[PDB]
Amino acid sequence: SNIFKLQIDELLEQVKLKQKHVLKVEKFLHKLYDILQEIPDWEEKSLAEVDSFFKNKIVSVPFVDPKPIPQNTNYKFNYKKPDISLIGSFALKAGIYQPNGSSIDTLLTMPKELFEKKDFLNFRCLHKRSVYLAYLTHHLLILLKKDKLDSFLQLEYSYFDNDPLLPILRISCSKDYNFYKTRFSINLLIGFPYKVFEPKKLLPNRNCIRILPATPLYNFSVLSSSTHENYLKYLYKTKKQTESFVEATVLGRLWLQQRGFSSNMSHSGSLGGFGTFEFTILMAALLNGGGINSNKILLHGFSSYQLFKGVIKYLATMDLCHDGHLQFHSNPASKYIDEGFQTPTLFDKSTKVNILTKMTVSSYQILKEYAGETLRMLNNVVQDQFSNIFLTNISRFDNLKYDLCYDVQLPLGKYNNLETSLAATFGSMERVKFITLENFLAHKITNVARYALGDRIKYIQIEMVGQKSDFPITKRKVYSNTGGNHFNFDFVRVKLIVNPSECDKLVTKGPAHSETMSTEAAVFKNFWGIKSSLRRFKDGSITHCCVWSTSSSEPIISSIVNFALQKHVSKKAQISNETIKKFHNFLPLPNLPSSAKTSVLNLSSFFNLKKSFDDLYKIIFQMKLPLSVKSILPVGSAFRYTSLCQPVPFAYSDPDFFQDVILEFETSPKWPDEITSLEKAKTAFLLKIQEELSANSSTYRSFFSRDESIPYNLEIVTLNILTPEGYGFKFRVLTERDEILYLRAIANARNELKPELEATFLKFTAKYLASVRHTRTLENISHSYQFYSPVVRLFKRWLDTHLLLGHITDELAELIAIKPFVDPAPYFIPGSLENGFLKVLKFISQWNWKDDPLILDLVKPEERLTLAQYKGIQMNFTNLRNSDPNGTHLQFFVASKNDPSGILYSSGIPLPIATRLTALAKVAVNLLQTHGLNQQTINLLFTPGLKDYDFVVDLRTPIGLKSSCGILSAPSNFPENLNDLSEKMDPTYQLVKYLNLKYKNSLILSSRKYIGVNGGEKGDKNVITGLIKPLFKGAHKFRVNLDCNVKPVDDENVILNKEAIFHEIAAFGNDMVINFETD
Amino acid sequence: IEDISAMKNGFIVVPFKLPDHKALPASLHFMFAKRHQSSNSNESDCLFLVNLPLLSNIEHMKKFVGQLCGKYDTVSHVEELLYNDEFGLHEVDLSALTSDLMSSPRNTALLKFVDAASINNCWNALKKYSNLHAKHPNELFEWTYTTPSFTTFVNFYKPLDIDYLKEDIHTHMA
């Protein structure tokens, strides 16, 4: 807790530009408001002739629907002069310099005796507002034409704060007196006087409007458009009170900006409705109140970060919407009533206004948990995440922020076709409640989404995409037939963040069925109808249900949104997300009985080989060695729920088929003191296990395979039990005389062989010792992080399409992918598979190596990495980075409590492969922000390679191996000899491993190790890409230690022996090798 | 250009062919050779051999020797090959590095002789082959690939045979 105020001063130094971008803006501001001073008065009229006054004139007049008729509006217009001051962000000096450009604020208040005391009937108060600004802007365009500034400024009718019932006039400049640099637009918004009425008609429950529904939008909008200066009056009172306020408002407003809550409005489908001035007036309320015993929660005698802490702790803890609120008055305490209004509420007595009624229940419901999450990530003293809490824009992409996104195409036709296209109601009470059809059906579609899902998702957000908040003078509103309607969108993004525990629960229960059936059960069977059902279970429990059909491609969340869309809001709408099905059938389908109708969170094949290992586990405990088994325990990918083609029985060509599993015996003192004798003694134990197993449990098949992964000990022989249930296991023996034997090898090795022997011991520690706690923490974390297993499955599919997986280890990819789960901040936990995968890609693009490590605490939410251990991993990361500054050999530093060293999983990977990973992730993120998620977008995201690689050796196996690998578009037995598995399996990965292991100084190779996860439908084609070292850019002369294959042409120079070396590759695999290409 | 057939310090280029590939439209491999002696056992009277193919075992280096003997009647006592760490499996000896006994450069090979007549005969003979292949590379004696690679090395998925590793473990423990 020492760098935070330096971060405050640093972010302020980036944000202040407070003379050169603002003094000439004040100059043009002086010009504009003295122009509007010099605009004169205008007298009594009637709208039945102001229509002909605006008949063929260039100006137009905005309104709300319905358009005014002269019959019920025998109406009058007067034009007097307000005296202007400045308001808000500019007047409190909080200008933020976006590439987009913030707005500015202006004052057009209103006198008293030009309008009567009955502005509470059918919006003609805002009609005289509209005609007022219409004549003012026509005289402003005349003053444009006579003050010669026609060529560069532009006047624009607009919807103020995305509200169709408040129009404004914004000047924006288009290409001494012309200007384009700082934030652009100036507006022309109105004000009404302060005291207009009697005290009982400003509570938003009231009615006075035509055929008692409340009009909360109406009697909040007239109140907001009346009081735009009381807020600044007590705001400057609090400004005279506190010194913390400008720093408070600037850090709160860029907080709200980089998490996307703008102050437009939330009703018509926009993430936002909460903003900086609502934030500051509730800050001042919480400053001079906040307790039931009048506890002033904030004291205003100290700095800004603690007031930020206090105000977001308040608005995160204390609930405002569903049950009561604290209300405050100004002309000043605050106190809690417990009356929930089904609306985010905070109430006044000086203004008597409900300020957050511009903002929806769903937007408050998601913003409160944004605030709870930012409490969670700035109440932890261990890390430093100012970049997470104030720097990264989490709203800039449409799918890191939300788990699921669907289209809602609405080809409803026209406003008069709405009757028999829209399946909801369209009547007087609903359009006098919700002002426009856009926010009406947005509210209705959020209600039917929440009732269709309930606890099956966390939070909902709707947005009308393509919504436009400005319109030219040539048309009275927006009138553009976009996407199939005359309405202010083209289609609808429905967006979900999901409770991952109940994604694919195929029964959503209603109430229990009593005889006189309950009213919410009636609502349930009205909502479901043909799909609703009366129900009992295996415990004898009657309820109301509806069942679903789980599929690997389509999750049932899509079908339940499809049903609740094509029943209750339209019949001819279209709902789809083909991206979801695209990566869901990128994931390999196992050859299991009824495996197309399984889910994606289904771990049943993993449970099946776990049970077969339990049977082998029992029959290997119950036997007798001369030295009995201490612990047999599994360590493989199928046991930490990670293999791509999840294991079907009898699948030879799966390289994850043979599962790694480690047994250890007692701590016997009779181990031999030498490494090859120790390996042969361990295999003597394995030979006795094999002979007793083949003696008694004859239904298991067994052979021996020589391990070659640990370098320079050629005696490691592993056996291979082939279960009758259809699985294979690589049994190994761990002793207590191995790690101390390798450490004394480090000791008495030759002095220039210590890094090579430490590489050997790091491969040993990564394989036997640390892998056990690795698979423990991953198996124990997968059941709270339920999308982790499929996001690693197609993350390694992605990584094998791009064929880095022969170099980057599996466990390194597992740690890379568990980073956005154990630390999802500032984003949330991935509740969908695409969300997890592109959060992985976004992080590994965004993450820089040399300055920052990647620590990660593998713990479930709500054992954890403490401050001392965190500083220790920072210290040995600092030691690694100042022993090597630019990452020559140690290229990723990932570390946990299971590995404080960091070197373990990332050793032996080359710099072209590591930079290929980072560069390809940055290409992916750049392409996603270029085009967005589309079918061809995902398809070239998963296309293999086609970049600056230099060899393409093209390969086929004499038989396709997806039948015998378990990916279906049948193997069920083992042959009479256990050597036909050789020609049923592929050689390509270990052959290219020997190629790289011999050519390791001259060039690096690669291959796709899983041949038919990525190699076509037949499952046959694999590539081998070579890449010459940057050392071999010229033509060296022959030395003794340069490790190449040479073709000298002159006396001095040698060159790569290229043709003969890829011919020798072709001879080493010529039954497999069928084609060669240079780039 | 091929007529350069003598390097800076004693090196000899020995070229030979590569056989047919199904997707290649004169694939040529070189060896480098010097020679050296010492007072020790097998590092005496020995030629260096650089840029040797994949897993060059005994018997096809021996058919190379045998076609030289059946061609020019050279004196040649070579029937074992020394110090071919082909892929990189024997840089250290971890057994003697953590053991009581068994004690006592990159991509090079170490081909001994026993006779001064044999080393001078093979030296000037292969120098004459280097010169004649330098001015005409056409129909030299070549690489008879009666495949050693697919038999003597395809063991990666072949299981280790039971009685063989039983006898190995038994004699080593004994």
Swiss-Prot record, chain A:
Entry keywords, A to Z: Nucleus, Phosphoprotein, Ribonucleoprotein, Ribosome biogenesis, RNA-binding, rRNA processing
Localisation: Nucleus, Nucleolus
Keyword Methyltransferase listed: no
Pfam families assigned to the protein according to its UniProt record, in alphabetical order: Nrap, Nrap_D2, Nrap_D3, Nrap_D4, Nrap_D5, Nrap_D6
An annotated GO cellular component: nucleus
Keyword match RNA-binding: yes
Top-level division of the source organism's lineage: Eukaryota
One MF annotation (Gene Ontology) recorded for this entry: RNA binding
GO biological process: maturation of SSU-rRNA; nucleolar large rRNA transcription by RNA polymerase I; regulation of ribosomal protein gene transcription by RNA polymerase II; ribosomal small subunit assembly; rRNA processing; tRNA export from nucleus
Stated role: Involved in nucleolar processing of pre-18S ribosomal RNA and ribosome assembly.
Subunit text: Interacts with snoRNA U3. Interacts with MPP10. Component of the ribosomal small subunit (SSU) processome composed of at least 40 protein subunits and snoRNA U3. Interacts with UBP10.
Other observations noted: Present with 3260 molecules/cell in log phase SD medium.
PANTHER family documented for this protein: NUCLEOLAR PROTEIN 6, NUCLEOLAR RNA-ASSOCIATED PROTEIN
Family from the record: Belongs to the NRAP family.
Protein name: U3 small nucleolar RNA-associated protein 22
Organism: Saccharomyces cerevisiae (strain ATCC 204508 / S288c)
Curated annotation (Swiss-Prot), chain B:
GO cellular component: CURI complex; nucleolus; nucleoplasm; nucleus; small-subunit processome; UTP-C complex
Family, per entry: Belongs to the RRP7 family.
Organism phylogeny: Eukaryota, Fungi, Dikarya, Ascomycota, Saccharomycotina
Function per UniProt: Plays an important role in the synthesis of 18S rRNA but is not required for the 5.8S and 25S pathway. Is necessary for the cleavage at site A2. Is required for efficient association of RPS27 with the pre-ribosomal particle.
Source organism of this protein record: Saccharomyces cerevisiae (strain ATCC 204508 / S288c)
Disulfide bonds: none
GO MF annotations in UniProt: rRNA binding
Misc remark: Present with 2610 molecules/cell in log phase SD medium.
Full-protein positions shown: 3 to 189 of 297
Stated name of the protein: Ribosomal RNA-processing protein 7
Subunit annotation: Component of the 90S pre-ribosomal particle.
Keyword presence, Methyltransferase: no
Coiled-coil residue windows: none
Gene Ontology terms describing biological process: maturation of SSU-rRNA; nucleolar large rRNA transcription by RNA polymerase I; regulation of ribosomal protein gene transcription by RNA polymerase II; ribosomal small subunit assembly; rRNA processing
Record keywords, A-Z: Nucleus, Ribosome biogenesis, rRNA processing
Cellular compartments annotated: Nucleus, Nucleolus
Keyword rRNA processing found: yes
Superkingdom assignment: Eukaryota
